[PDB]
Amino acid sequence: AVVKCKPTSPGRRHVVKVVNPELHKGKPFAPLLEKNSKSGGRNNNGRITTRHIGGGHKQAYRIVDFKRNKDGIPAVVERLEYDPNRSANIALVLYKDGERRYILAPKGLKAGDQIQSGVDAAIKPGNTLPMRNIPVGSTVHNVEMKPGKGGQLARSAGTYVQIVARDGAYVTLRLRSGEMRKVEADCRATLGEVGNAEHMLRVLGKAGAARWRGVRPTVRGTAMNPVDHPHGGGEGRNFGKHPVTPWGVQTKGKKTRSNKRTDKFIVRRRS
């Protein structure tokens, strides 16, 4: 549910929380945990290569099954859990043979539900099939781009993909961006939408709430000196130039896609 905080202090007045009473309150499933230490946005030259990253809360990595290739064996949802690594929630599922795995939690999935993968799985939310076996027009998520590679599209909270057509070895998908994209029909997809759609309704409310998430402050280029940024300089607030990135490329409409290798799969760009 979406809950406004009461304004008992200035840093709380605008906070809006997403509170889900169904998420597990205890610890995660340890055999599927890994450590995952932070980067500060720095690569192996030790240089900052993505600005505005650092700090935030310590986080363990949950191994999530994006391939969904344990075919023919049913699993039951044991519990939903918070995952710090992503916007979606995850579900711990127990297979009939006694194996446990984490999956992205689809909308509507709850403890006790049954799921299955494979060519013969039923058309139900949480089931995974090759898109060859999914009716045209369906809503799916966690879509593979190459067969067997694992889900890569529509994984964020509340996202989904529409199967709009099927021609030969390929299906045409409408992505969340609005792009129409061809993908091999042997690629798998999970029925339904990714859950936790209220994610986008939260309001951080204060500066520190962004710092808790590992985001460091953004300094506007127009607030700098010319040596630092093309926008810098001026006696007072001055601008007088076409907006650019810190490295000089136009940043208000100039397109940057240049991938002739994958152009053949884009039926229609998002705009």
Partner RNA sequence: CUUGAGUCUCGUAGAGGGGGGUAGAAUUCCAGGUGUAGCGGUGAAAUGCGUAGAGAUCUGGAGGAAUACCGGUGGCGAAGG
Partner RNA sequence: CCGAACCGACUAAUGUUGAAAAAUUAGCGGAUGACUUGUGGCUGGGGGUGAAAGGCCAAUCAAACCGGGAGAUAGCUGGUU
Partner RNA sequence: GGAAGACCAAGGGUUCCUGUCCAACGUUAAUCGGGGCAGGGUGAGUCGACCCCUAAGGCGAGGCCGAAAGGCGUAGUCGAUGGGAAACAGGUUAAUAUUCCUGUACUUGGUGUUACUGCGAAGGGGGGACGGAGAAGGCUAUGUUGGCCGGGCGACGGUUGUCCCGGUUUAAGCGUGUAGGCUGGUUUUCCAGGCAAAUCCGGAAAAUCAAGGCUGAGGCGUGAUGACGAGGCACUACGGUGCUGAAGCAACAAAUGCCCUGCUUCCAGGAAAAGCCUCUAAGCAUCAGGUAACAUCAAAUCGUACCCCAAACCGACACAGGUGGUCAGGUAGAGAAUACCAAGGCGCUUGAGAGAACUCGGGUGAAGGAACUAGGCAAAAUGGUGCCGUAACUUCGGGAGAAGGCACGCUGAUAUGUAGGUGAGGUCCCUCGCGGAUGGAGCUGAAAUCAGUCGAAGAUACCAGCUGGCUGCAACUGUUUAUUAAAAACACAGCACUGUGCAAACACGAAAGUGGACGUAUACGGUGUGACGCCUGCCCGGUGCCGGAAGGUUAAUUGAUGGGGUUAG
Partner RNA sequence: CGGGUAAGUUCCGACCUGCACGAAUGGCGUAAUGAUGGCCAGGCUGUCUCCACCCGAGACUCAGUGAAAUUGAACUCGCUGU
Q: Which residues bind Mg ion (CB under 5 A)?
A: 52, 218, 236
Size of residue set near RNA by CB under 7 A: 146
Q: Does 120 bind RNA (CB under 7 A)?
A: no
Dihedral sign, Cα of residue 175, residue 177, residue 180, residue 183? negative
Q: Which of 158, 170, 171, 191 binds RNA (CB under 7 A)?
A: 158
Residue 71: partners with Cβ closer than 8 Å, 6 or more residues away = 117, 118, 119, 121
- Binders of RNA among residues 190 to 219 (CB under 7 A) are 194, 196-200, 202-213, 215-219
Q: Which of 83, 106, 125, 141 binds K ion (CB under 5 A)?
A: 83
Q: Which residue has the tokens 């994984």?
A: 155
Select from 13-21, 121-129, 184-192 the region that touches RNA (CB under 7 A).
Answer: 13-21
Q: Environment class of residue 17 by beta-carbon count within 10 Å: exposed (0-12), middle (13-18) or buried (19+)? A: middle
List the single partner that 206 binds among K ion, Mg ion, RNA, none, CB under 5 to 8 Å by kind.
RNA
Select from 117-125, 126-134, 159-167, 184-192 the region that touches RNA (CB under 7 A).
Answer: 159-167
Tell me the C-alpha distance between 150 and 69, whole Å.
Answer: 9
Select from 48-56, 75-83, 127-135, 208-216 the region that touches K ion (CB under 5 A).
Answer: 75-83
Residues forming a β-bridge with 244: 250
Q: Does 234 bind K ion (CB under 5 A)?
A: yes
**Contact indicator for 161, 182 with CB cutoff of 8 Å:** no
